[PDB]
Amino acid sequence: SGFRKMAFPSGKVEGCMVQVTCGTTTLNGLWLDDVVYCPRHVICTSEDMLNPNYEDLLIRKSNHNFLVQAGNVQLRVIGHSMQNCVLKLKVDTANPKTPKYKFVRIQPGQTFSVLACYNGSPSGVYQCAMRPNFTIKGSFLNGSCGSVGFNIDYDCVSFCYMHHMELPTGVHAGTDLEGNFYGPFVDRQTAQAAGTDTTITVNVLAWLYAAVINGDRWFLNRFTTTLNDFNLVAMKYNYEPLTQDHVDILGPLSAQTGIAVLDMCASLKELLQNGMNGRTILGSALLEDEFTPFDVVRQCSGVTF
Amino acid sequence: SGFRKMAFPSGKVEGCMVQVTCGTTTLNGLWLDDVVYCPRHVICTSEDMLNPNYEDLLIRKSNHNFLVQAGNVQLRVIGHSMQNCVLKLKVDTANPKTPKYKFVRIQPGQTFSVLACYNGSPSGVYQCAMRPNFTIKGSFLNGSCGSVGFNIDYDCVSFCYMHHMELPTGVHAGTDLEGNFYGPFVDRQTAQAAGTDTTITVNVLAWLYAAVINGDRWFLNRFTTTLNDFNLVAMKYNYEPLTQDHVDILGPLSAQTGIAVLDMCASLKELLQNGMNGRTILGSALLEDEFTPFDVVRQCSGVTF
Numbered sequence: 001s002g003f004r005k006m007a008f009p010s011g012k013v014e015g016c017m018v019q020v021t022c023g024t025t026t027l028n029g030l031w032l033d034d035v036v037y038c039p040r041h042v043i044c045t046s047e048d049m050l051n052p053n054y055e056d057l058l059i060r061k062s063n064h065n066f067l068v069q070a071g072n073v074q075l076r077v078i079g080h081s082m083q084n085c086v087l088k089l090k091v092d093t094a095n096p097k098t099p100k101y102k103f104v105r106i107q108p109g110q111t112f113s114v115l116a117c118y119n120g121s122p123s124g125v126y127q128c129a130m131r132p133n134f135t136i137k138g139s140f141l142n143g144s145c146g147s148v149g150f151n152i153d154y155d156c157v158s159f160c161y162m163h164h165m166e167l168p169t170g171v172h173a174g175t176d177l178e179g180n181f182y183g184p185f186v187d188r189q190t191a192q193a194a195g196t197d198t199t200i201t202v203n204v205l206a207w208l209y210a211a212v213i214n215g216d217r218w219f220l221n222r223f224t225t226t227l228n229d230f231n232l233v234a235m236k237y238n239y240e241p242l243t244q245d246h247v248d249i250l251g252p253l254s255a256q257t258g259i260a261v262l263d264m265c266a267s268l269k270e271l272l273q274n275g276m277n278g279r280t281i282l283g284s285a286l287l288e289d290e291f292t293p294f295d296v297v298r299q300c301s302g303v304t305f
Numbered sequence: 306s307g308f309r310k311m312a313f314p315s316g317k318v319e320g321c322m323v324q325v326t327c328g329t330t331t332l333n334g335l336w337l338d339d340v341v342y343c344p345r346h347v348i349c350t351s352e353d354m355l356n357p358n359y360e361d362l363l364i365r366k367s368n369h370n371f372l373v374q375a376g377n378v379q380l381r382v383i384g385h386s387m388q389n390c391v392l393k394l395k396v397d398t399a400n401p402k403t404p405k406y407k408f409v410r411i412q413p414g415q416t417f418s419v420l421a422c423y424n425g426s427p428s429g430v431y432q433c434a435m436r437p438n439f440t441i442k443g444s445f446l447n448g449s450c451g452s453v454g455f456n457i458d459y460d461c462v463s464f465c466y467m468h469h470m471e472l473p474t475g476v477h478a479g480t481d482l483e484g485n486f487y488g489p490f491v492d493r494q495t496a497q498a499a500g501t502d503t504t505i506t507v508n509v510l511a512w513l514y515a516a517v518i519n520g521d522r523w524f525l526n527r528f529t530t531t532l533n534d535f536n537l538v539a540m541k542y543n544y545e546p547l548t549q550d551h552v553d554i555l556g557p558l559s560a561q562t563g564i565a566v567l568d569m570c571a572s573l574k575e576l577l578q579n580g581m582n583g584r585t586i587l588g589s590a591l592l593e594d595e596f597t598p599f600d601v602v603r604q605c606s607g608v609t610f
């Protein structure tokens with residue numbers, strides 16, 4: 001027992017990280033098969049950044065301008081293209097360390113692991129959620145651009161995130177591996193509004209189930225609620241609406257604990273209306289929304305890769 | 306910016322995990338050079354567990370009784386010895402994936418990453434502290450025994466922890482890699498008192514520095530304190546005493562923020578006496594004690610391996 005914010009083992013991804021240099025800028029790339037993926041803003045200079053013309057900037061570059069280094073080994077670049085906000089550099093060698101992998105665009109509220117890297121070298125790994133407003137609350141310093149987020153299912157790495165920028169508000173934004181931003185963001189240095197964020201209700205409930213499984217049970221109460229009544233409360237507290245699809249995905253946890261989903265909603269209701277009265281749940285004094293129902297079951301059942 | 310509970314990249318350790326089976330019990334081993342390390346309780350059965358006679362149990366075992374499997378590859382065991390609470394199985398092949406490594410006994414209050422494994426396969430990675438009472442608050446299910454904790458400095462993995470057991474209170478206990486338990490624990494199924502635990506004061510202060518660096522500054526106040534006055538408060542709130550050695554290690558963070566260590570103590574004092582008044586610091590509604598001063602600087606300066 002016990003419950004922690006657990007990341008995927010990062011080995012399969014560490015083997016894919018490289019450094020990509022263009023002019024004076026260095027950041028991280030992802031080397032899969034014979035293609036290196038990185039943020040297209042590697043080709044910008046400081047003047048370029050307020051409104052880069054990426055098409056014009058890329059035209060002034062040739063294959064030999066992109067320096068790609070994997071540990072000590074230099075890779076030879078034989079083609080380049082821009083897809084959306086990512087650059088794809090074709091190299092002459094397939095990465096021998098390439099895992100089975102897929103590219104996925106995840107949904108808001110889903111979680112993934114981030115391998116933070118600088119100069120193509122891994123620094124640390126942590127678990128994140130894609131916020132409902134399509135930002136992530138990460139830990140990234142300058143030089144972390146091109147760090148990726150991923151999930152692993154058996155032997156298969158599903159890459160879902162590549163880091164591009166920190167917004168002036170101090171949260172993070174980036175793309176899928178086809179170079180499409182999550183959210184309304186663009187790769188230029190402007191103030192950019194991230195929408196209203198909300199709490200991921202289905203995750204909080206998953207985490208409450210996790211707490212019961214681990215024997216934190218003090219917040220269980222004598223009440224129940226309806227989906228409609230609960231959603232009135234959810235809206236007041238800036239929680240995402242709970243749908244029957246959400247209730248359905250919580251089914252396995254409901255079965256395991258014998259606590260019906262709507263009874264657990266009535267617990268959550270009481271916590272939202274009354275707070276925690278200075279108590280803790282799984283070591284936390286607020287309601288945690290960065291564990292999916294899938295995450296709770298995996299951690300509580302101990303799936304490996 | 307941003308601040309997360311970040312684990313070391315786990316790749317170097319994943320390459321060292323194996324499954325070790327003796328009779329009906331399977332758990333995890335660590336394969337370094339030509340030696341596999343695992344918890345000695347692999348040789349017990351259910352009857353054995355209340356007070357195993359490990360010497361007598363081991364005498365009934367031969368090299369060929371220890372089945373060691375690394376992925377699909379079976380290893381040949383050519384020697385066995387018990388050191389303290391660990392078994393050391395000599396195998397005929399050096400692990401080709403062995404990193405530069407050291408074995409270290411860490412101090413209470415130090416942090417490390419855990420790679421949770423089942424049947425020799427990695428499941429997840431997370432960051433922990435060794436509690437002042439020499440327990441860890443992990444996430445371990447049955448079959449996780451032999452999972453290890455580690456730190457990495459450049460290319461060198463310092464192994465500090467091997468998981469042995471969950472206590473009836475639901476916290477975790479284990480050994481260094483020489484098989485010496487942290488704390489008073491023994492590898493037999495009895496009720497075992499873990500001492501009074503305290504909060505790791507030097508870590509809380511490191512984390513407050515981290516919050517200032519990231520722009521969470523609301524708890525900074527107009528006050529200062531002395532080491533003696535602060536320690537009166539620390540004792541009332543079951544915090545570890547702060548020593549000048551602690552003040553010294555916080556020096557770099559003090560320099561970076563320009564906030565003297567004792568002024569940050571006066572902030573912490575006010576938080577202990579007044580609570581957080583329903584506010585948060587770095588996304589937390591309690592005082593976090595699982596980041597060392599070294600951790601904060603690394604994360605805030607972005608060191609790689």
Ligand SMILES: C[C@H]1c2ccsc2CCN1C(=O)Cn1nnc2ccccc21
Binds near residue numbers: 041166190
């Ligand atoms: C100005 C901004 C930007 C805006 C549009 S594209 C782009 C690339 C450069 N940039 C960054 O934010 C880079 N970056 N990413 N994560 C960071 C964490 C700490 C510091 C810098 C960081």
Ligand SMILES: C[C@H]1c2ccsc2CCN1C(=O)Cn1nnc2ccccc21
Binds near residue numbers: 493
């Ligand atoms: C009975 C106890 C024990 C006590 C003395 S040696 C020993 C080995 C077996 N054991 C464990 O606790 C094993 N274990 N370790 N982490 C766990 C998490 C969830 C469930 C079982 C777990």
